[PDB]
């Protein structure tokens, strides 16, 4: 079977070596003859003439394309080629990576990225992960937003936990008075997390408005998809420090691996068809000779394109033509203005580079630690720690997430990250009361050695050791008042009394 690989960029023969020179392409009656054609151009005339020559003269039925340009219309140019050739097409990189519209019933063009509902679900999973149920939505008049917000809603009420959607925004940049109208609801901006929907040119204006109002303060975390942020290398000056985006795996998942997986899926689909019907659908005779009654010849091909299993992984696409298990990467731009991958999503598993929420402290003065570091030792009923309900993601509202410490003597070379568990207590009640009164917060974690503290040859350990070494700023626990601790820490006003007491049987 004739396969054409369109090269636009710096890709070389190493991709060819990694793609087809490593896997077995047997079990096919006809050997897959692959030809690579390279061009820097996306101008329609040259590419359509080249593909017409490859289709009529050479009878090529497989299309593989990747590039490194932000041009998004070529993704659906590929869809037109699919409509005009009835041959499978796969989008991989660059201009063939982002989302596509006009899902055509007669076209079988597939894309390796995430489908709109897929990044919607990933974003709401991230939203649940950072368990801050207050958020807003800023969305421009770019079409396709209605279905996006529709599915966001559908899922947000599908999970019947107590969400809090502040507002949904429709932006009109075609009118200068549109921004002035927008200012009224911008006055209603109080949620620290806002979900953005726009293009890149609209994005620049959006960031300009955001940093003109002053939405770059602490706690203001922004999550945008790949379309909004464009390319990672191109960093507009409007990008605020600590800006987080979600895209596809561009670093760990290299392009040769992508094309190898794609060609393996193509071979599997061809073998499945050959087992299904045992005939080779001949391509069109000419580009001007469109096949109308032969659609059924290729539609059966499509019947195997959605469901393909490769290397024991469910790399199969979905109904709209998007891989149901995509390797998604959440990247963060820090004060250094460099993009660092801080989250991964693959094989229905979500992993955070930081178990504790990363400190996206902005470039603001003061930088007072409103989130005081708090350590506590398990002592019921002051402390009641329980496992977080996996079905609900959290526990009931009065519980607070607290961290089991990083200790494992089995393998000290690897640090076993803190473990989030839902914990409650009278002390925690005092803490939330004082946090709501003083308008500050706190992080909860567990003492390393499971002890209140003792002066081991002058050096303090336990909670007292953490406080002495400034690891724990403020202390929380049922610890009495001692003179040795008084010389190293400051004892606050006690909230309950105790002492040398004697208990006897009631009898």
């Amino acid at each position: 079977i004739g396969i054409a690989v369109i090269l636009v960029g710096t890709s070389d023969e190493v991709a060819i070596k990694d793609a087809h020179e490593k896997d077995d392409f047997h079990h096919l009656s006809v050997v897959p003859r692959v030809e690579l054609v390279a061009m820097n151009e996306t101008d329609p005339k040259s590419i359509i003439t080249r593909i017409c020559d490859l289709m009529s003269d050479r009878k090529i039925q497989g299309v593989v394309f990747a590039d490194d340009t932000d041009q998004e219309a070529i993704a659906q140019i590929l869809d037109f080629i699919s409509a005009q050739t009835l041959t499978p097409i796969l989008g991989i990189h660059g201009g063939s990576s982002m989302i596509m519209a006009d899902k055509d019933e007669s076209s079988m063009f597939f894309q390796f990225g995430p489908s709109i509902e897929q990044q919607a679900s990933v974003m709401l999973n991230i939203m649940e992960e950072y368990d801050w149920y207050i958020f807003s939505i800023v969305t421009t008049y770019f079409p396709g937003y209605q279905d996006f917000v529709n599915k966001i809603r559908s899922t947000i009420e599908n999970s019947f936990v107590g969400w809090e959607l502040e507002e949904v925004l429709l932006l009109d940049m075609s009118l200068d008075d549109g921004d002035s109208k927008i200012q009224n609801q911008l006055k209603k901006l109080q949620s620290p997390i806002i979900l953005l929907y726009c293009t890149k040119e609209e994005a620049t204006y959006i960031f300009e408005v955001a940093n003109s109002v002053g939405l770059t303060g602490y706690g203001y975390t922004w999550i945008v998809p790949s379309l909004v942020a464009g390319d990672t290398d191109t960093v507009p000056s409007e990008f605020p420090t600590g800006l987080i985006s979600v895209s596809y795996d561009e670093w760990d998942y290299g392009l040769p691996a992508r094309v190898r997986d794609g060609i393996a899926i193509i071979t599997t689909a061809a073998s499945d068809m050959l087992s299904e019907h045992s005939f080779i659908p001949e391509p069109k005779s000419s580009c001007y000779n469109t096949h109308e009654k032969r659609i059924y010849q290729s539609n059966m091909l499509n019947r195997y394109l959605i469901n393909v299993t490769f290397e024991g992984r469910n790399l199969s696409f979905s109904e709209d033509g998007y891989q149901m298990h995509p390797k998604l990467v959440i990247i963060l731009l820090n004060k250094e203005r460099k993009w660092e991958r801080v989250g991964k999503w693959k094989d229905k598993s979500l992993q955070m580079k930081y178990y504790v929420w990363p400190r996206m402290c902005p470039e603001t003065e003061e930088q007072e630690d409103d989130h005081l570091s708090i350590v506590t030792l398990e002592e019921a009923p002051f402390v009641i720690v329980e496992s977080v309900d996996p079905l609900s993601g959290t526990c009931m509202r009065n519980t607070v997430p607290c961290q089991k410490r990083i200790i494992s003597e089995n393998k000290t070379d690897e640090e076993p990250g803190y473990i989030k568990k839902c914990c409650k207590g009278f002390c925690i009640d005092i803490l939330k009361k004082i946090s709501k009164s003083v308008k500050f917060t706190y992080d909860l974690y567990l003492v390393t050695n499971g002890k209140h503290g003792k002066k081991i040859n002058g050096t303090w350990n336990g909670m007292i050791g953490e406080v002495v070494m400034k690891r724990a700023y403020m202390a929380v626990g049922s610890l009495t008042i001692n003179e040795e601790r008084s010389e190293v820490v400051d004892f606050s006003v006690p909230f309950i009394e105790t002492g040398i007491s004697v208990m006897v049987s009631r009898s």
Partner: antibody
Framework: VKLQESGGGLVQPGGSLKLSCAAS??????MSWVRQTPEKRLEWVAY???????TYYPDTVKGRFTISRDNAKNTLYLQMNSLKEDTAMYYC???????????????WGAGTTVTV | DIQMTQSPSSLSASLGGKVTITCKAS??????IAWYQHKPGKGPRLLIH???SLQPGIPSRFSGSGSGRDYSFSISNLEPEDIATYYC????????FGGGTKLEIK
């Protein structure tokens, strides 16, 4: 990379003799060989893909030849059993572009004789 | 496995003469023609790709006609230094060889 044949000979009547052609990376490049008829006719013997699979034979030596490959030494392993009436001369060849498919090849070996 | 046969496996020529070999394929190759040769101890060499495909270090006197199932390969005024035998080989199902054709000089 250059191909050099070794293990040519069919002295034992009715036996099974091992021919090979080593290469001097060749790990990702497929390999083929051609037998010479007494009428000088060039004939295919066995087929191996780049990954070692797809071990098929033409309609002349089907079901009687054993073939294998090893990329560690860049060698092929072919057993001759039914070439008694042939003073054959096989030569190895490496198709270009590697892969499991087949193309047109130019890098050719040295030539080893097989005599009874 | 797709098969192929060659004809007439014989030629009658000398230092001068246009010799034509007819390739009779079985499956529609759509230009998958290949022409090879070999020497009894000089070392074979690649001659002809698709129709009249020129190659470096290769004379262009060779000509080709026809397509698909029927091909005709012609050599005009061959030299007495490249006296060898030619072969029409294709590739549809793995490899597809045939009987081949001869070439003898009086």
């Amino acid at each position: 990379v250059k191909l050099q044949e070794s293990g040519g000979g069919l002295v034992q009547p009715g036996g099974s003799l091992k021919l090979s052609c080593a290469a001097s990376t060749f790990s990702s490049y497929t390999m083929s060989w051609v037998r010479q008829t007494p009428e000088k006719r060039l004939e295919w013997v066995a087929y191996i893909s780049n990954g070692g699979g797809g071990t098929y034979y033409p309609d002349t030596v089907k079901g009687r030849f054993t073939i294998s490959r090893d990329n560690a030494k860049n060698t092929l392993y072919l057993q001759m059993n039914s070439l008694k009436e042939d003073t054959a001369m096989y030569y190895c060849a490496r198709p270009s572009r590697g892969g499991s498919s087949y193309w047109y090849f130019d890098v050719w070996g040295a030539g080893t004789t097989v005599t009874v | 496995d797709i098969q192929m046969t060659q004809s007439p496996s014989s030629l009658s020529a000398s230092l001068g003469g246009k010799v034509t070999i007819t390739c009779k394929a079985s499956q529609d190759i759509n230009k998958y023609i290949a022409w090879y040769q070999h020497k009894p101890g000089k070392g074979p060499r690649l001659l002809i790709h698709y129709t009249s495909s020129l190659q470096p270090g290769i004379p262009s006197r060779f000509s080709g006609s026809g397509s698909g199932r029927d091909y005709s390969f012609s050599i005009s005024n061959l030299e007495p230094e490249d006296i060898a035998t030619y072969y029409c080989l294709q590739y549809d199902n793995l490899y597809t060889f045939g009987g081949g054709t001869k070439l003898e000089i009086k």
